[PDB]
Paper text:
We recently discovered that FEM1B, a substrate receptor of Cullin 2-RING ligase (CRL2), recognizes C-degrons containing a C-terminal proline. By solving several cryo-EM structures of CRL2FEM1B bound to different C-degrons, we elucidate the dimeric assembly of the complex. Furthermore, we reveal distinct dimerization states of unmodified and neddylated CRL2FEM1B to uncover the NEDD8-mediated activation mechanism of CRL2FEM1B. Our research also indicates that, FEM1B utilizes a bipartite mechanism to recognize both the C-terminal proline and an upstream aromatic residue within the substrate.
Unexpectedly, unmodified CRL2FEM1B adopts two different dimerization states, with one symmetric and the other asymmetric. The cryo-EM structures of the symmetric and asymmetric dimers of the CRL2FEM1B heteropentamer (FEM1B-EB-EC-CUL2-RBX1) were solved at resolutions of 3.39 Å and 3.37 Å, respectively. Hereafter, the symmetric dimer is referred to as dimers, and the asymmetric dimer is designated as dimera. Unlike dimers, dimera adopts a ring-like architecture, with the two CRL2 protomers binding to each other in an asymmetric manner. Specifically, the C-terminal hydrophobic patch of FEM1B.p2 interacts with α17 of FEM1B.p1. The C-terminal hydrophobic patch of FEM1B.p1 in turn associates with RBX1.p2 to seal the ring, with Ile546, Phe549, and Leu550 of FEM1B.p1 forming hydrophobic interactions with Trp35, Ile37, Ile49, Met50, and Trp72 of RBX1.p2. RBX1.p2 associates with the WHB domain of CUL2.p2, which characterizes an autoinhibitory state for unmodified CRL2. In contrast to RBX1.p2, RBX1.p1 does not contact the WHB domain of CUL2.p1 but associates with the middle region of CUL2.p2, providing additional interprotomer interactions. In the dimera structure, the CUL2.p2 WHB domain interacts with RBX1.p2, with Lys689 forming electrostatic interactions with RBX1.p2 Glu55; the CUL2.p1 WHB domain associates with CUL2.p2, with Lys689 forming hydrogen bonds with Gly360 and Gln362 of CUL2.p2. Therefore, Lys689 neddylation disrupts the assembly of the dimera by introducing potential steric clashes.
Residue numbers in the entry:
A (entry chain E): 21 to 106
B (entry chain B): 246 to 744
C (entry chain A): 163 to 412
Write the structure that this text describes.
């Protein structure tokens, strides 16, 4: 029996932005959000509007709302978030 | 004569009398002064050199010969003070000797030679020729020795070096570093040693590393140390990231129970010299696979748009060995920890079971068995201890080291010549990229130049970074030909055109 | 004649002198015609050839998308485009040099703009310097190819610039802000010069993207760029006790 106590690890983070994709869910923006992907029967498939910042970054409204409930900063570029469209 | 023309003549003829008293008394006999200048400089006689300098400065065109003689003397002094270095301690004593020469000759110029800026320029050119003493067509040992010097004096060592001594030593060292004219090589080498020292925890203090990065930034610029400062910033924010991950796993629904003291070192990909060059697919053990999954969930939740490339050759951790009575806890790389867990899977294990349990390539695997057997952690049950087709080997019961925290890895220095050549090739590629940028910028600005003027302007533009060669430049024109961006002129091959 | 040029496209090397000699006949017969000395050549051979090279490179481009991704598809297209420049040079009249290449482009790169433009985002964002110099020279020839790379580079510089000038330390914000733009400006001037031919349509894409990051304003606030660049002048034009020599200031 060998028991591992520590696993001090090194990982490289790199940007993985793909075209027309919600960065929080890693899925397409026109599709439903991953928070609304579950219980799809209850969801009306209409409230997952695409929210655009003034930095021209598009997420879903629910995902950016849940993001702003923790931090007021855009994930893809570390600047504050201003809605401009819906 | 000055006091005489002051007490006899008009104020308007003070200079003209002195000018004719010098242009016909120490400028008509200028050949004798210039002939004795070499000897009076090489002997280093203080008052005689001071009077010689005053007289030559009085002459309109009598000083530059003294500049050349002094520069040659400094070049010879630096060459005789840097070519006798041994391999016992080269990075320290090389920079120490260059500092001694520079300080002594700055004192000589400032004290008994008026501190002329032309003489300082000559000293700078002479030391530039000294430290860049290229052994003919083989190497340039200056940037590697400077990087090794920084690594040696910034590494956490038990020899004894206080913070203030290190800081003033680096402040002195920057004067040596200011004239290397191969700073790309030093940048890559310092990035490699900084990566090793930050990851393996060999830094004596983060303040020392930040101060050294600030010194290099003030020496060259923000573009020189942008990557180094991003490395330091990631290493400083690593603690906040670990705290945030622990808060994340404490605030989940169920008890995750990682079972290991996970401590991640998430690094920015573009700013670090690290890469996934060992492209072998590594099978993470299950107890580490749970932690990998949970940190992937965290780094996909609290950070968005970032893919997390895992490095399995910069990872290390403590493993316990309570199977044989728990003698100690071993620090070990994850490559070797995988085969230790495979040993846990079955006492009798072969190479095929290792291959199907780790999925990793044969060279890194064989390196792991070698680095386990040389520390007598394991014994080979076959007739011969080296690699073979079968390779069946079990745990060694005779390991009785006296350390309760014995470490079986020592790959903190490395610096194998293969990766040294890989680093130099990366420098060469970056040099080629910069030369292509300069060539395209100059052509877009002017569209008509000759070969020699192009070479001279490339040297002038890239003087602060490196010393480019003709073959590399012509390779850059060849690459732009292959990309159909450049063309030589139809009238003459000397001139150049645009596609 | 089309068969032994199509066979040349398949790899084999036929008689170059015979093919060029027969092709030269359709234009050397008409040497005594004062008006339209190439009307025979442009209908007997060139019009069938431009149709033949149209239905062949349409078949070849569709044959390359099946077993090649966008990274090595452009290596193959540039290999065919460079070969076709050589191949038509030694076979056809110099008048039909441009028509064959331009019709080759309209079957490989122009018919597959949507495939190249969809992958143009990953080429710019990941900074593939080899693939960006291929997507350029393919889309430079097409009239409507560049205006999507120009947008994707401007979106990349704006996102790279905004990320670089983000969460600067309050201690050295006037100096960190200027040097963060200059490293983004310095990186992308060189990237455009080395890779994208130093194109002015892309330098304007950089200037239109660096203007947005410099003039980026916090919510319910005002742009702090004029204030930060006023302090950067002030910080280094004072009597600097520590370093900052005369040659460095200028
Ligand atoms: Zn979403
Ligand atoms: Zn939703
Ligand atoms: Zn954003």
């Amino acid at each position: 029996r060998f028991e591992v106590k520590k696993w001090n690890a090194v990982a490289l983070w790199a940007w993985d932005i793909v075209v027309d994709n919600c960065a929080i869910c890693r899925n397409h923006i026109m599709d439903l959000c991953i928070e609304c992907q579950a219980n799809q029967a209850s969801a009306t498939s209409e409230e997952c509007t695409v929210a655009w910042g003034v930095c021209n970054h598009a997420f879903h409204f629910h995902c950016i709302s849940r993001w702003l409930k923790t931090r007021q900063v855009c994930p893809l570029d570390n600047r504050e978030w201003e809605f401009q469209k819906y | 004569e000055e006091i005489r023309c002051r007490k006899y003549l008009h104020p308007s003829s003070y200079t003209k009398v002195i000018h004719e008293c010098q242009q016909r008394m120490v400028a008509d006999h200028l050949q004798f002064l210039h002939a004795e200048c070499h000897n009076i400089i090489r002997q280093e006689k203080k008052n005689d050199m001071a009077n010689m300098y005053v007289l030559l400065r009085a002459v309109s065109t009598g000083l530059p010969h003294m500049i050349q003689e002094l520069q040659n003397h400094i070049h010879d002094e630096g060459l005789r003070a840097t070519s006798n270095l041994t391999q016992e301690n080269m990075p320290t004593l090389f920079v120490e000797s260059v500092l001694e020469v520079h300080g002594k000759f700055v004192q000589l110029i400032n004290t008994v030679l008026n501190g002329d800026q032309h003489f300082m320029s000559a000293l700078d050119k002479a030391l530039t020729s000294v430290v860049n003493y290229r052994e003919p067509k083989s190497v340039c040992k200056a940037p590697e020795l400077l990087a090794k010097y920084c690594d040696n004096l910034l590494k956490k060592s038990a020899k004894g070096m206080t913070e203030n001594e290190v800081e003033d030593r680096l402040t002195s060292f920057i004067t040596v570093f200011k004239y290397i004219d191969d700073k790309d090589v030093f940048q890559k080498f310092y990035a490699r040693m900084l990566a090793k020292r930050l990851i393996h925890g060999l830094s004596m203090s983060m303040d020392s590393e930040e101060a050294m990065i600030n010194k290099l930034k003030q020496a060259c610029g923000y573009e020189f140390t942008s990557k180094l400062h991003r490395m330091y910033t990631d290493m400083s924010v690593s603690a906040d990231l670990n705290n945030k991950f622990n808060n994340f796993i404490k605030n989940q629904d169920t008890v995750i129970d990682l079972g290991i003291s996970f401590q991640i070192y998430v690094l920015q990909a573009g700013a670090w010299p690290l890469t996934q060059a060992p492209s072998s697919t590594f099978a993470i053990p299950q107890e580490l696979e749970k932690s990998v999954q949970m940190f992937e969930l965290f780094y996909s939740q609290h950070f968005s748009g970032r893919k997390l490339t895992w490095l399995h050759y910069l990872c290390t951790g403590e493993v316990k060995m309570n199977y044989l009575g728990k003698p100690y806890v071993a620090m070990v790389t994850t490559y070797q920890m995988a085969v230790l867990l495979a040993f846990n899977n079955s006492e009798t294990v072969s190479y095929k079971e290792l291959q199907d349990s780790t999925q990793m390539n044969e060279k890194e695997l064989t390196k792991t068995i070698k680095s386990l057997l040389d520390v007598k952690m394991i014994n080979h049950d076959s007739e011969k201890e080296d690699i073979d087709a079968e390779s069946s080997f079990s745990l060694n019961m005779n390991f009785s080291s006296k350390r309760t925290k014995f470490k079986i890895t020592t790959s903190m220095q490395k610096d194998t010549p293969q990766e040294m050549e890989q680093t130099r090739s990366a420098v060469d590629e970056d040099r080629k990229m910069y030369l292509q940028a300069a060539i395209v910028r100059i052509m877009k600005a002017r569209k008509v130049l000759r070969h020699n003027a192009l070479i001279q302007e490339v040297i002038s533009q890239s003087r602060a970074r490196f010393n480019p060669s003709i073959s590399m430049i012509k390779k850059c024109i060849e690459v732009l030909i292959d990309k159909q961006y450049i063309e030589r002129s139809q009238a003459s091959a000397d001139e150049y055109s645009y596609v | 004649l089309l068969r032994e040029i199509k066979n040349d496209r398949g790899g084999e090397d036929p008689n170059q002198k015979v093919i060029h000699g027969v092709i030269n006949s359709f234009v050397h017969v008409e040497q005594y015609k004062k008006k339209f000395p190439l009307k025979f050549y442009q209908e007997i051979f060139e019009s069938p050839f431009l149709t033949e090279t149209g239905e062949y490179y349409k078949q070849e481009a569709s044959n390359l998308l099946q077993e090649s991704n966008c990274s090595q598809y452009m290596e193959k297209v540039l290999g065919r485009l460079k070969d076709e420049e050589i191949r038509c040079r030694k076979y056809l009249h110099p008048s039909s040099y441009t028509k064959v290449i331009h019709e080759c482009q309209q079957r490989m790169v122009a018919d597959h703009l949507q495939f190249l433009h969809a992958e143009c985002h990953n080429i710019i964002r990941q900074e593939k310097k080899n693939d960006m110099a291929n997507m350029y020279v393919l889309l430079r020839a097409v009239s409507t190819g560049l205006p999507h790379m120009i947008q994707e580079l401007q979106n990349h510089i704006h996102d790279e610039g905004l990320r670089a000038t983000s969460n600067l330390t309050q201690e050295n914000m006037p100096t960190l802000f200027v040097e963060s733009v200059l490293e983004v400006h310095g990186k992308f001037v060189q990237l455009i010069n080395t890779v994208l031919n130093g194109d002015q349509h892309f330098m304007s894409a950089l200037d239109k993207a660096l203007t947005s990051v410099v003039n980026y304003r916090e919510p319910k606030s005002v742009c702090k760029a004029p204030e930060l660049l006023a302090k950067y002048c002030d910080n280094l034009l004072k009597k600097s006790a520590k370093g900052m020599t005369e040659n460095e200031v200028e």
